[PDB]
Amino acid sequence: SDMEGTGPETGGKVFDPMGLSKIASAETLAWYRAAELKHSRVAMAAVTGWAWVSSGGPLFPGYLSVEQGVTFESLGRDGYAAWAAVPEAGKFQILGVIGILEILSESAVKPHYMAGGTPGKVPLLWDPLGFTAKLSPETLARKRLAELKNGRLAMIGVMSLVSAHFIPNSVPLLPGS
Amino acid sequence: SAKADLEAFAKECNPVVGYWDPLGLADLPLWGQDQDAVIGWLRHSEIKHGRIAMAGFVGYIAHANGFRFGGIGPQNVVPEGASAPEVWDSIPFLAKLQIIGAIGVLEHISEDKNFLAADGMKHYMRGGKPGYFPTFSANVHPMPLNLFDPFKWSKNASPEKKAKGLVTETNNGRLAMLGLFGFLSESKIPGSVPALSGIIPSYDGDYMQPFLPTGPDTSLWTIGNLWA
Amino acid sequence: KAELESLAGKLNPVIGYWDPLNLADYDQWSQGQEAAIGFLRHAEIKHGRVAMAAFVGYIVQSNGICWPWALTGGPNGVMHSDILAAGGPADQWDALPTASKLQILLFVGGLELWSENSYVLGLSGEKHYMRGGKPGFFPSIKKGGIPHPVPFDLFDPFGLSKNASPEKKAKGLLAEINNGRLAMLGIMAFVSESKVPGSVPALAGKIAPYSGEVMAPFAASDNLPFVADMLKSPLF
Amino acid sequence: ALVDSMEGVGEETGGQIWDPLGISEAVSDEAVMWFRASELKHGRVAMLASVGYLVGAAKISFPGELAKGVTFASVAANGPYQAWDAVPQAGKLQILSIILALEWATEAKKPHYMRGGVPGKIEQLPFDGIQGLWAPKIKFWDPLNFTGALSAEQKARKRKAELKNGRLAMIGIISFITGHNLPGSVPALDSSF
Numbered sequence A: 001s002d003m004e005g006t007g008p009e010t011g012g013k014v015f016d017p018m019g020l021s022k023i024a025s026a027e028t029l030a031w032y033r034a035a036e037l038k039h040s041r042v043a044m045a046a047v048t049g050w051a052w053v054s055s056g057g058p059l060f061p062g063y064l065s066v067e068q069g070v071t072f073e074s075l076g077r078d079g080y081a082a083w084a085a086v087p088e089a090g091k092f093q094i095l096g097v098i099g100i101l102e103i104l105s106e107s108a109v110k111p112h113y114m115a116g117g118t119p120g121k122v123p124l125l126w127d128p129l130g131f132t133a134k135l136s137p138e139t140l141a142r143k144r145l146a147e148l149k150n151g152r153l154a155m156i157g158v159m160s161l162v163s164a165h166f167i168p169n170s171v172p173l174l175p176g177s
Numbered sequence B: 001s002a003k004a005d006l007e008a009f010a011k012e013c014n015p016v017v018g019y020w021d022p023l024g025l026a027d028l029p030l031w032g033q034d035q036d037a038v039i040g041w042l043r044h045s046e047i048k049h050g051r052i053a054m055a056g057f058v059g060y061i062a063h064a065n066g067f068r069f070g071g072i073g074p075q076n077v078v079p080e081g082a083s084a085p086e087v088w089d090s091i092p093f094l095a096k097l098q099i100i101g102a103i104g105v106l107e108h109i110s111e112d113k114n115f116l117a118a119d120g121m122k123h124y125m126r127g128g129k130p131g132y133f134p135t136f137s138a139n140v141h142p143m144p145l146n147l148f149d150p151f152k153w154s155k156n157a158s159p160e161k162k163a164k165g166l167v168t169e170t171n172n173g174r175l176a177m178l179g180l181f182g183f184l185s186e187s188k189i190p191g192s193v194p195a196l197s198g199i200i201p202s203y204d205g206d207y208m209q210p211f212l213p214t215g216p217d218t219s220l221w222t223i224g225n226l227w228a
Numbered sequence C: 001k002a003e004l005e006s007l008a009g010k011l012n013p014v015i016g017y018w019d020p021l022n023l024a025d026y027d028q029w030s031q032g033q034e035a036a037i038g039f040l041r042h043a044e045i046k047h048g049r050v051a052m053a054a055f056v057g058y059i060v061q062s063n064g065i066c067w068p069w070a071l072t073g074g075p076n077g078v079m080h081s082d083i084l085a086a087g088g089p090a091d092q093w094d095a096l097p098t099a100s101k102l103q104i105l106l107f108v109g110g111l112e113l114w115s116e117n118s119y120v121l122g123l124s125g126e127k128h129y130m131r132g133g134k135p136g137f138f139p140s141i142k143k144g145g146i147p148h149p150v151p152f153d154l155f156d157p158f159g160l161s162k163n164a165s166p167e168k169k170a171k172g173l174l175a176e177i178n179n180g181r182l183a184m185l186g187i188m189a190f191v192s193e194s195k196v197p198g199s200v201p202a203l204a205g206k207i208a209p210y211s212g213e214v215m216a217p218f219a220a221s222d223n224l225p226f227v228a229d230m231l232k233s234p235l236f
Numbered sequence D: 001a002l003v004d005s006m007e008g009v010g011e012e013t014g015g016q017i018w019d020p021l022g023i024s025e026a027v028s029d030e031a032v033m034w035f036r037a038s039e040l041k042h043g044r045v046a047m048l049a050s051v052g053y054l055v056g057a058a059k060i061s062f063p064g065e066l067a068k069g070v071t072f073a074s075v076a077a078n079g080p081y082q083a084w085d086a087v088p089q090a091g092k093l094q095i096l097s098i099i100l101a102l103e104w105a106t107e108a109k110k111p112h113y114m115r116g117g118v119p120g121k122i123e124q125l126p127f128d129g130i131q132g133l134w135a136p137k138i139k140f141w142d143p144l145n146f147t148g149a150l151s152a153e154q155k156a157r158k159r160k161a162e163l164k165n166g167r168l169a170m171i172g173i174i175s176f177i178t179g180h181n182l183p184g185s186v187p188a189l190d191s192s193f
């Protein structure tokens, strides 16, 4: 409906050529915004990682798992090839921490986003140092809109990287590997 | 209050530029510590950085030209002509330790509440004057003369002259920051600044590590040198 | 505005406001329309002034004229006529060491920064050329700042325009606009005659070849970052 | 007492009673007092166990000799699991004797925590007032009066912190033991756990 997210580049109006609303309630629109925000944030983290690792970056100094024979620089510079070179213990640790965090996010917000609440406001994991602890209500909406726009652009970015890795010469700026 | 004072101070620093805060640092709560304390901390950091940059610029010139104090002291170990980054490479390691320790003593005196309430003034993060160094009427043994005005040349100037002096101090500090890091950038990457290309030689060590090239353990002491 | 109708009529009474593109209605900056005509007028005047300067520079640099000064930098360097021995006045810019072009471009940039500043323009009495004000007005280099006193201002340094007639100043502004348009045509005719030999009726066999790009300030001899990577593919 | 007016709650499970299986609703008040006492004893035991297991895993040992002929580092030469079996049986029996005396004297106190006492509030002197037995007046909890400078609100906040840390410590010590017994289960334990 009205919500956040809209602004310039569309005319101040909602963008949905295929309908995908008018079959949605407040609960369904809240799910839409929660999924959009989670996908947006994950995609921003994903582009900030793949871009840093593949292009340049000093990489983390150290060893990564003193027992198995792996080095931070031995993982490589490719995105998908280095992910497979991450040990199974590290992969399971990452997935388990993410699962624990999201299960607690589902069970920790008592006005649930599907039962009231605000979509995308997950407990913890945001500013521990309180950078946005003094921002005005008017300025915070601008930052939320900027988050949404940067997240959509990053969604397109991760899918561009995935397309360039899987089917070569797609996304013409991205190289063949 | 503090923000308006920042606007005014930025106006008298440069009326053409004025208040130039692109990265909004005058609005971040650092330690959840209000606005005025953050402003005081930022101003104190700027003034301290500027003073250290000015002193470092003059010291860099003195070291690169060759300006040894005399005999017997720690200048005896440093070779005649080594460029400024290498005079903090051949002084004794204990000399570096005691220099940094005395700098820390001065920092502690600068923020000690007992040294600061002896002059009747408060912390810069608690409503004080940023960059103010206190007197020495709290030590335990009397100091001959203070740090800010070692002689009594000051203290008769008008407050307006003091404000103009503070503005000149801040501007000269920023310019000295730029100059000293021009020196350090030429000492690492060639052709960074155009004017100093070929003047300052290249350095290999780390500029942020005080004791990675540890100096010698040479005990420059005679008469009663019972500590070996 | 709609005052530019009368100004176009004063520039030429036969052909008045001539705009097939209707670019005065084009709100390219999404400000008020007044800002759009102000930007267009200031751009036209600045383009014209740069073009007359470049035209006279081309004319006096194309026929063996060079200053007898040095431009060396210390016991070696250009003799200030070796640039003249590089060809016509387009290889000369591509022969001015490295720092000379940098300092010239930075001087022009600081001059434009002095032009744009509303605190400097407002201290003279005018405003920015799109926020009202007078297009083409250069503010005083003396009143706005510059803590060490300077001898002269940029516009009218020797003072030989003071207490002039205001209608004479308006006539001078109109003549400046017309001579600016004519000088833009002249300097682009010369720049086209550099690369393209077959253009124009006149100027045949009087212009240096200049196998290079007129629109590339920095040359292949510059040791700035990229640059050589930026000159790895020519064009037409 | 009632499970509603208790100090678990926590912001992690929103701010209501977590109980998903309805254990506290099917049982009476006395079982809730027993559950809180068992939870707090479990949390304190698990906190001490987690700290000791981390110390043993870091190969940190006392400078000296455990038994005459047996160095502390000789026992600590392997992991924490194969250190309990290297302690002499007499020392472990003395440890269990002190623990048995503490448990017995703790439960022997009056207003039992089911019959009027506060669950988890172990009183300061468990070995006081016992005929035929004497002990110094060293307190069990806070021999130094650290929680005497605190107010009521600080005490409530630190009790909540204790409950949360106890639950985390139970998870941690069970993770340590399971990772040693079944390697590859807990990926956070490299080799020496």
Ligand code: CLA
Binding pocket: B006, B009, B010, B013, B017, B018, B019, B020, B021, B022, B023, B024, B025, B026, B042, B043, B045, B046, B049, B174, B175, B177, B178
């Ligand atoms: C570390 C030194 C230092 C410190 C602590 C400050 C502190 C301050 N400056 Mg200041 N300044 C400095 C150096 C410093 N300055 C230098 C070198 C110059 C000359 C270029 C200036 C010029 C200047 C102006 C013109 C003004 C200030 C102002 C201010 C105040 C608030 C504005 C702000 O965001 O802070 C400044 C911001 C920072 C210090 C950013 C933190 C450092 C970041 C995180 C690292 C960036 C590194 C990066 C590689 C730089 C890229 C450079 C380039 C590519 C663009 C604040 C007290 C305003 C004022 O008058 O208030 C008193 C103001 O209008 N500054």
Ligand code: CLA
Binding pocket: D003, D004, D006, D007, D008, D009, D010, D013, D016, D017, D018, D019, D023, D024, D032, D035, D036, D038, D039, D042, D167, D168, D170, D171, D174
């Ligand atoms: C054996 C240890 C133990 C005991 C006795 C209790 C007891 C209690 N807890 Mg508690 N808790 C524990 C461990 C324990 N907890 C752990 C480890 C966690 C972290 C996940 C929590 C998290 C927790 C929360 C968030 C809350 C409580 C609350 C409560 C109180 C009311 C719930 C109730 O009646 O359940 C009685 C409980 C039992 C009878 C224990 C049954 C255990 C079964 C038999 C075994 C199941 C274990 C299962 C297989 C998982 C094992 C693997 C594990 C390592 C992950 C009660 C006093 C609530 C409270 O205090 O509200 C006032 C409350 O909000 N607990």
Ligand code: CLA
Binding pocket: D045, D048, D049, D050, D051, D052, D053, D055, D056, D060, D061, D062, D066, D071, D072, D073, D075, D076, D080, D083, D084, D087
């Ligand atoms: C569940 C609890 C538990 C258990 C079963 C063990 C079991 C063991 N520990 Mg151990 N330990 C624990 C907790 C525990 N630890 C904690 C919490 C610490 C941190 C203080 C340590 C620090 C520790 C060291 C440094 C060493 C052992 C060692 C040992 C082994 C030999 C037994 C021994 O000397 O005990 C010693 C046990 C302790 C000193 C812990 C005392 C626990 C009490 C309840 C705390 C008292 C409070 C107070 C802070 C203590 C100081 C008070 C005093 C200054 C007045 C054995 C495997 C030794 C080893 O590696 O094998 C020989 C050894 O050198 N432990």
Ligand code: CLA
Binding pocket: D131, D132, D133
């Ligand atoms: C040789 C075996 C033996 C003997 C002779 C006794 C004798 C006694 N027991 Mg007893 N007891 C024993 C074994 C024994 N017990 C065992 C194995 C247990 C199970 C752990 C108990 C548990 C027990 C309880 C629970 C109680 C008694 C009590 C008593 C006393 C009854 C009346 C009385 O004097 O109260 C007045 C009490 C005294 C005069 C106390 C003085 C006794 C001190 C401890 C003597 C010091 C002995 C010294 C340390 C050397 C012993 C070495 C040994 C530890 C290796 C009486 C002295 C009752 C009592 O009141 O005693 C506290 C009581 O409540 N006993």
Ligand SMILES: CC(=O)O[C@H]1CC(C)(C)C(=C=C/C(C)=C/C=C/C(C)=C/C=C/C=C(C)/C=C/C=C(\C)C(=O)C[C@@]23O[C@]2(C)C[C@@H](O)CC3(C)C)[C@](C)(O)C1
Binding pocket: B054, B055, B057, B058, B165, B172, B173, B175, B176, B178, B179, B180, B182, B183, B193, B194, B195, B196
């Ligand atoms: C294209 C290119 O490369 O250009 C290059 C050119 C070049 C030159 C190479 C470059 C450089 C280096 C630069 C510009 C370095 C600048 C260094 C700078 C600006 C250094 C300030 C020192 C101030 C001091 C020590 C203050 C002393 C102050 C003192 C001793 C006092 O407090 C005394 C006093 O206060 C009392 C007590 C009472 C007052 O009543 C009177 C006074 C005020 C006397 C650059 C940046 O790289 C750019």
Ligand SMILES: CC(=O)O[C@H]1CC(C)(C)C(=C=C/C(C)=C/C=C/C(C)=C/C=C/C=C(C)/C=C/C=C(\C)C(=O)C[C@@]23O[C@]2(C)C[C@@H](O)CC3(C)C)[C@](C)(O)C1
Binding pocket: C052, C053, C055, C056, C161, C172, C179, C180, C182, C183, C185, C186, C187, C189, C190, C200, C201, C202, C203
């Ligand atoms: C009395 C009084 O007010 O005092 C002063 C005050 C005041 C205001 C300060 C003054 C001033 C300032 C100054 C110094 C102003 C200077 C202005 C300047 C320097 C004006 C250059 C123009 C160059 C042009 C138009 C070039 C055209 C070029 C043309 C037309 C061509 O080449 C055409 C052509 O190429 C084509 C297109 C094709 C070819 O086939 C054929 C040819 C080659 C023919 C004044 C004006 O001095 C008066």
Ligand SMILES: CC(=O)O[C@H]1CC(C)(C)C(=C=C/C(C)=C/C=C/C(C)=C/C=C/C=C(C)/C=C/C=C(\C)C(=O)C[C@@]23O[C@]2(C)C[C@@H](O)CC3(C)C)[C@](C)(O)C1
Binding pocket: A100, A104, D008, D009, D010, D011, D012, D013, D163, D164, D167, D168, D171
């Ligand atoms: C105030 C408040 O709110 O309290 C807080 C306290 C606290 C601690 C801060 C909280 C937290 C956060 C955390 C860290 C929660 C962590 C939870 C965690 C880490 C839970 C791991 C479970 C692992 C299991 C079940 C393993 C199963 C293992 C199984 C099922 C097997 O494989 C067994 C088996 O292979 C055998 C052995 C052989 C055969 O038999 C076959 C099978 C396959 C069956 C909470 C939750 O926020 C609440």
Ligand SMILES: CC1=C(C#C/C(C)=C/C=C/C(C)=C/C=C/C=C(C)/C=C/C=C(C)/C=C/[C@@]23O[C@]2(C)C[C@@H](O)CC3(C)C)C(C)(C)C[C@H](O)C1
Binding pocket: B145, B146, B147, B148, B150, B223, B224, B225, B226
């Ligand atoms: C030989 C002997 C022994 C001995 C000995 C002893 C006593 C050795 C002592 C060595 C000693 C006592 C070494 C001091 C150095 C002091 C320095 C470097 C101070 C610089 C101080 C400076 C640079 C201060 C500068 C400023 O203050 C100025 C001027 C103005 C202020 O506004 C600002 C500041 C504060 C910055 C034995 C073994 C113990 C017993 C045996 O029987 C005989």
